[PDB]
Amino acid sequence: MEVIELNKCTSGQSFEVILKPPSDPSLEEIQKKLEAAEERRKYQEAELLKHLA
Amino acid sequence: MYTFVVRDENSSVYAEVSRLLLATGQWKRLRKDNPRFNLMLGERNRLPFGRLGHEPGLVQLVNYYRGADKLCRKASLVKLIKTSPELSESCTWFPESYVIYPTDEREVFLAAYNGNVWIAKSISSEASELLDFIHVIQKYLEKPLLLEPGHRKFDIRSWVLVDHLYNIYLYREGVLRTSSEPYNSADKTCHLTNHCIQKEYSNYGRYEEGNEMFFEEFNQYLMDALNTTLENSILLQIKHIIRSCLMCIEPAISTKHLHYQSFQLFGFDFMVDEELKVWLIEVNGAPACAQKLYAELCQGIVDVAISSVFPLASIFIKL
Amino acid sequence: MREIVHIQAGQCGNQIGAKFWEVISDEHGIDPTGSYHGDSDLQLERINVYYNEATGNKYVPRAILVDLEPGTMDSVRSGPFGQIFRPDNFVFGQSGAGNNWAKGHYTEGAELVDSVLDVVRKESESCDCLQGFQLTHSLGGGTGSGMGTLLISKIREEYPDRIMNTFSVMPSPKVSDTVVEPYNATLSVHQLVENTDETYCIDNEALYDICFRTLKLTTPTYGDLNHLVSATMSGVTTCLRFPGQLNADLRKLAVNMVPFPRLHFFMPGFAPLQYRALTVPELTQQMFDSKNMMAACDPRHGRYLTVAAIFRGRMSMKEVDEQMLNVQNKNSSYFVEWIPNNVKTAVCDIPPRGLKMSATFIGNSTAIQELFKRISEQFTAMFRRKAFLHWYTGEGMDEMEFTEAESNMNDLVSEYQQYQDA
Amino acid sequence: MRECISIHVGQAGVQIGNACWELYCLEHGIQPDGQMPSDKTIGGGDDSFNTFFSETGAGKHVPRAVFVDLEPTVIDEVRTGTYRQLFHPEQLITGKEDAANNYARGHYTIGKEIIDLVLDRIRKLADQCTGLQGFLVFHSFGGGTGSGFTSLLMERLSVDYGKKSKLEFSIYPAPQVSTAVVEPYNSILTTHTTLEHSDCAFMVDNEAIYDICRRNLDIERPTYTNLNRLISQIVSSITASLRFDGALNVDLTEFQTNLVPYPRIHFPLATYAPVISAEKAYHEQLSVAEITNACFEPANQMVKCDPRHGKYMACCLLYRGDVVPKDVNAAIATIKTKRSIQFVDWCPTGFKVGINYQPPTVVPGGDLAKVQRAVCMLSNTTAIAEAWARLDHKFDLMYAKRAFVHWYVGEGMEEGEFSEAREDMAALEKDYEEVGVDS
Numbered sequence A: 001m002e003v004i005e006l007n008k009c010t011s012g013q014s015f016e017v018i019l020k021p022p023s024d025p026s027l028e029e030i031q032k033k034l035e036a037a038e039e040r041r042k043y044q045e046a047e048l049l050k051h052l053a
Numbered sequence B: 001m002y003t004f005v006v007r008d009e010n011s012s013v014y015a016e017v018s019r020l021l022l023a024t025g026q027w028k029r030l031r032k033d034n035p036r037f038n039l040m041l042g043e044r045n046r047l048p049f050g051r052l053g054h055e056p057g058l059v060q061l062v063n064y065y066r067g068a069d070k071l072c073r074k075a076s077l078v079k080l081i082k083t084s085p086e087l088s089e090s091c092t093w094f095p096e097s098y099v100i101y102p103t104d105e106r107e108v109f110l111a112a113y114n115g116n117v118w119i120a121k122s123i124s125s126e127a128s129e130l131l132d133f134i135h136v137i138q139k140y141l142e143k144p145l146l147l148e149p150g151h152r153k154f155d156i157r158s159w160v161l162v163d164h165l166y167n168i169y170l171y172r173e174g175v176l177r178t179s180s181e182p183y184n185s186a187d188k189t190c191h192l193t194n195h196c197i198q199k200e201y202s203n204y205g206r207y208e209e210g211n212e213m214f215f216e217e218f219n220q221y222l223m224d225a226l227n228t229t230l231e232n233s234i235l236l237q238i239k240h241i242i243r244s245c246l247m248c249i250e251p252a253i254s255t256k257h258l259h260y261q262s263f264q265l266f267g268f269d270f271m272v273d274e275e276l277k278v279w280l281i282e283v284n285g286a287p288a289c290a291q292k293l294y295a296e297l298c299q300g301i302v303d304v305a306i307s308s309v310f311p312l313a314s315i316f317i318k319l
Numbered sequence C: 001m002r003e004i005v006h007i008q009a010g011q012c013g014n015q016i017g018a019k020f021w022e023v024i025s026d027e028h029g030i031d032p033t034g035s036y037h038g039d040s041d042l043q044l045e046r047i048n049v050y051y052n053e054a055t056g057n058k059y060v061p062r063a064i065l066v067d068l069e070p071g072t073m074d075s076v077r078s079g080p081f082g083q084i085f086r087p088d089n090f091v092f093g094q095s096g097a098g099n100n101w102a103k104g105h106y107t108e109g110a111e112l113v114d115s116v117l118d119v120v121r122k123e124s125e126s127c128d129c130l131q132g133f134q135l136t137h138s139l140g141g142g143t144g145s146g147m148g149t150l151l152i153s154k155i156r157e158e159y160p161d162r163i164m165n166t167f168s169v170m171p172s173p174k175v176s177d178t179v180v181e182p183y184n185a186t187l188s189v190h191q192l193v194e195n196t197d198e199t200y201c202i203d204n205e206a207l208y209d210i211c212f213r214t215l216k217l218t219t220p221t222y223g224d225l226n227h228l229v230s231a232t233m234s235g236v237t238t239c240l241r242f243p244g245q246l247n248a249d250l251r252k253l254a255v256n257m258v259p260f261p262r263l264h265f266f267m268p269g270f271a272p273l274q275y276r277a278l279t280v281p282e283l284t285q286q287m288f289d290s291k292n293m294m295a296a297c298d299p300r301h302g303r304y305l306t307v308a309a310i311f312r313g314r315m316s317m318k319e320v321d322e323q324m325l326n327v328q329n330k331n332s333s334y335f336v337e338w339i340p341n342n343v344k345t346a347v348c349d350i351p352p353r354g355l356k357m358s359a360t361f362i363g364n365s366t367a368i369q370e371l372f373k374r375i376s377e378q379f380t381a382m383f384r385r386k387a388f389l390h391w392y393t394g395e396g397m398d399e400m401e402f403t404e405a406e407s408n409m410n411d412l413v414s415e416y417q418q419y420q421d422a
Numbered sequence D: 001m002r003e004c005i006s007i008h009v010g011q012a013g014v015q016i017g018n019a020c021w022e023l024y025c026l027e028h029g030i031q032p033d034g035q036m037p038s039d040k041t042i043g044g045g046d047d048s049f050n051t052f053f054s055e056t057g058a059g060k061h062v063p064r065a066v067f068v069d070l071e072p073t074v075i076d077e078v079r080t081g082t083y084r085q086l087f088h089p090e091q092l093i094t095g096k097e098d099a100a101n102n103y104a105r106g107h108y109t110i111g112k113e114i115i116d117l118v119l120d121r122i123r124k125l126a127d128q129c130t131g132l133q134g135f136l137v138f139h140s141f142g143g144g145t146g147s148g149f150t151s152l153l154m155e156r157l158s159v160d161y162g163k164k165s166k167l168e169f170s171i172y173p174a175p176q177v178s179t180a181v182v183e184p185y186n187s188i189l190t191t192h193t194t195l196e197h198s199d200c201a202f203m204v205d206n207e208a209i210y211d212i213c214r215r216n217l218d219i220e221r222p223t224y225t226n227l228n229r230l231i232s233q234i235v236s237s238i239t240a241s242l243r244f245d246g247a248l249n250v251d252l253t254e255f256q257t258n259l260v261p262y263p264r265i266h267f268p269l270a271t272y273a274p275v276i277s278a279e280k281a282y283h284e285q286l287s288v289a290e291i292t293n294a295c296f297e298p299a300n301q302m303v304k305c306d307p308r309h310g311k312y313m314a315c316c317l318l319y320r321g322d323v324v325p326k327d328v329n330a331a332i333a334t335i336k337t338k339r340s341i342q343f344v345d346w347c348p349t350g351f352k353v354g355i356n357y358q359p360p361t362v363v364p365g366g367d368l369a370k371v372q373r374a375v376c377m378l379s380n381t382t383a384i385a386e387a388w389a390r391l392d393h394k395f396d397l398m399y400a401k402r403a404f405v406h407w408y409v410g411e412g413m414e415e416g417e418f419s420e421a422r423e424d425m426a427a428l429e430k431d432y433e434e435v436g437v438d439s
């Protein structure tokens, strides 16, 4: 069991004890998808209004 | 009225416990996938312990211990004994063992290779024929004890129940499974002493009934023939071996402070040599029972493993 | 401010709507003058879901009263809380609808609908955040049924993204005005399947039975039945009307109670129907007994898809869960397993007038199919001989619209059966 | 010094935020008016607490925080609660109507229309930062806002601050507290969408916290206030190293470095002890050994699971109070010999310890008693995967019959995002399967 990297200060202390060693989407793509979903809504609403007519 | 489900349809013993639970009128069964249960009797493979103990207002209980396969797969058993401090390398009741891949140990296996006849399953005298089976390798026990008359080998099966509190219960009744056929030396019938190459090729249950001899009978034989008892010559070692194995794995499988609880039934298998020394063959996580016992035992389970946790409206020795 | 606009139509719709307002106005501490004299602010914190404020700080129901003849509304007006309503909010014709769905939907009702939509628009436009609409009506007459469904269509057209909710009284031979009730109800259910998000099915058969085999009323009046309906309606709206650990609103309700868009017809339950307060275990048992259901289907003939239950009064939240959980884990045959955690429980501290403990249940059960079968069988018994149809063909309808309405109800039934067996 | 910005989203995010900031103010000695007597550099500074607070010429200390909810009622209690003076009105952002427990409505429909305003109000905070490390995002998995809006915001923060670190505190759904049957759906959805955008996420299963409040504070029916105060103790322990002088976990990059070798497996299990009732008349103050030991009981984990049956990838101990290294190593010694603590082969069996001599602060009239020493352990075990398997199974139960899906489709989402989300989680379960188990 070894202690390593000890650091002290007025608030407390830090250290590391060892027991054994070892053997992005763009803005445009977002806008696309967020608008291909507005369209689906709009479409659904347009179907509704057609049927109501 | 307590509740439970069944996820191994074709499990002899638990089939019987299900059946016995309804006969009390206090237990209702549910469908396999209904999570609102008090008691699971889970599957043999990939039991989802991850989904137990997250149902509000239910105490839940299952008939298996997560991590018990450590003791029930031979590779893991060997590894567990060689590696566990509380077991030492050679603890003296386990056959000399090596685990080799299709660890492995091949090299250190050969250093202690200078009676050099073995067995590698999961029997040969020469290394090649078995090693070319492309498992575990053990030292086959050349000089076993024989029952008389018949020069007949045998193994012992003992049944262990472990409850949610980690009490260790050894069933009063054990069974001898004999190769009631004379015993040669290097002819391949008596060598595999069990109902695993005799229920097909092998004159079935000759010298004794269905190859199965019981405890009263065997104790009398041990008295008459050897001037000893079963308790002295054999059971102390057995009790010691069971304690040592289960107590070894206790802190890794125990459900003392878990959100669900476990119990499980094991079948320990032993061999006695001619010096009246007991050896551990293997540990079975889902054992069958023996026809005339699947009753006293199956009810014992209910009494101690279940109604202990779920009280209603001895055949075991504590270890 | 999640306002609700309430609409009540026809004789039944206005009779029960009126009782409803009597009950909740009393729970909120408003008197027949719209003046507040309550003792808490739990009464006032969400008072605006149902009530608009006045110049003198009075409270006035966000309610619109509709009928094709004036009788009932004259009664409502001359009743106990009659003067609370906005008088501009009484909208009525003179001729009636003759228990005829066609007159309410197509002829007589068409002529009144726009003035109703005018009062609706006037009430919506001053809403900080309108949740949706609540309609009280029966399905067996002409006004509440034909005109009520017509109204729901128009409202959906003008406010397609608001929630539409009905309390819908289903007819029964036991307590019946005319023989054409099955026709009117089968035509109305068809509209309700397409155009509502939530419908509370209030069966008059059940209300009669609870009144007769339980309340021990030997000759049950519409007032008796409406007293059950009043209690159920008050219970079912407790979580909207009061502050709790839940924020209840109509949309969240619909999201959590309706897994398939067409299966939004709910069986309500109530307990109790007295100086000894009930204990939590009794509430729980009673609520879930068929005898406390108001739709006249037996819940053991089907399975619960979802359930919402409130307990009213000061009691043991722990004992509630214990009991709730208990009745599930005693009856798992009658809840679906493929919807985890499908029973939800809440507690309000304020109980209703005259009880220190009560419990109200909203169930989406597949057993409701029994109700639709009952109606279908009756519809078909006449329609197969085209009996009574001239009353509708004379207002312009064709048999075709009937055959379709029949078909869509039987499909609804098949749908409920499919999920009872999954 | 290097700033951190906290973003609270939805009821859970906001309410937990209230708990945490209240705590922060009690710990650093800041008053409800934003005044901090002990801050002698009036109107500026770059002490450690300045990571979470900026200052104004009049000596007011102001949270580097943004609260966001699609409905106003929760954030209104902040707008006019005990700490109304702390915040700039523009840090509190509210919509008209909420997401109705619908991920799709929070993400696509309503999100789209508040997102630019949110990013903007956040930019106004980043602009006051000389060297911003990144973000701390608090939210529920189960709400419509907490799931949908959060994943949208996390998608955009990656674009506008591609260099910054992002950490989550997420509320995982439990039936004994939950508000909706569709929480599994929202959970999977938000996890899938948010996964490649977050660096370290601390899950808190509400079930576990509820149980802890019951079992240790002897509260019959724990409230949000109870749960939240406890969760805030944990968050405080975790964030204490950014706001105080120390040498472990000093920036958000260090959380990733120390706890997350694989980018996808970034959910460290938190364990905390001790939790002690304020109405416990007689209380025997516990020891280093005892509390460190308690870090290996499931009953103290933020997510119930059984680490004996997984492998570790990292372990961090964080003590607060009367603790010195000697007692720590002694406790580790004894524990190593009683417990089964397996690390993976390609990582060191060991512990990164950090200590702060100031003991835990508690809310006066709270339900937590004051203790002399406390610890929070952050480990990365494969065992937490159990919590994915639970969630996924619930999802599978509902999605097989397509129950509730129409509410999502109705908002613009396609049924395909469900099978995609779920496939991603199937992949995640598999990854944990490799790292932790042997074929």
Ligand SMILES: Nc1nc2c(ncn2[C@@H]2O[C@H](COP(=O)(O)OP(=O)(O)OP(=O)(O)O)[C@@H](O)[C@H]2O)c(=O)[nH]1
Residues within 6 Å of the ligand: D009, D010, D011, D012, D013, D015, D016, D070, D098, D099, D100, D101, D102, D106, D140, D141, D142, D143, D144, D145, D146, D147, D171, D172, D173, D174, D177, D178, D179, D183, D206, D224, D227, D228, D231
């Ligand atoms: N621990 C804790 N959990 C909470 C709290 N508030 C809500 N939750 C949990 O959050 C989930 C519901 O999410 P909310 O945060 O309330 O939803 P939301 O983000 O406001 O989204 P909406 O659906 O639009 O209201 C449920 O699992 C609740 O149990 C809280 O204050 N503390």
Ligand SMILES: Nc1nc2c(ncn2[C@@H]2O[C@H](COP(=O)(O)OP(=O)(O)O)[C@@H](O)[C@H]2O)c(=O)[nH]1
Residues within 6 Å of the ligand: C009, C010, C011, C012, C013, C015, C016, C097, C098, C099, C100, C138, C139, C140, C141, C142, C143, C144, C145, C169, C170, C171, C172, C175, C176, C177, C181, C204, C207, C222, C223, C225, C226, C229
């Ligand atoms: N429960 C209840 N049912 C009613 C009431 N009034 C009428 N009904 C039922 O409603 C149906 C008749 O509809 P009604 O409201 O009278 O006709 P409308 O004026 O055309 O809407 C029948 O099924 C009656 O049984 C009432 O006050 N309470």
Ligand SMILES: COc1ccc([C@H]2[C@@H](C)C(=O)N2c2cc(OC)c(OC)c(OC)c2)cc1O
Residues within 6 Å of the ligand: C235, C236, C237, C238, C239, C240, C246, C247, C248, C249, C250, C252, C253, C254, C256, C257, C306, C307, C308, C309, C310, C341, C342, C343, C344, C345, C346, C360, D178, D179, D180, D181
């Ligand atoms: C799972 O089923 C639920 C059913 C109902 C709710 C809540 C939330 C949607 C709300 O509003 N519900 C609600 C509304 C209720 O009335 C509006 C109500 O009883 C009257 C009730 O009892 C538990 C719950 C939450 C749920 O999780």
Ligand SMILES: [Ca+2]
Residues within 6 Å of the ligand: C095, C108, C111
């Ligand atoms: Ca006319």
Ligand SMILES: [Ca+2]
Residues within 6 Å of the ligand: D039, D040, D041, D042, D043, D044, D045, D046, D055
């Ligand atoms: Ca300063």
Ligand SMILES: [Mg+2]
Residues within 6 Å of the ligand: B269, B281, B282
């Ligand atoms: Mg064998």
Ligand SMILES: [Mg+2]
Residues within 6 Å of the ligand: C011, C141, C177
């Ligand atoms: Mg009438």
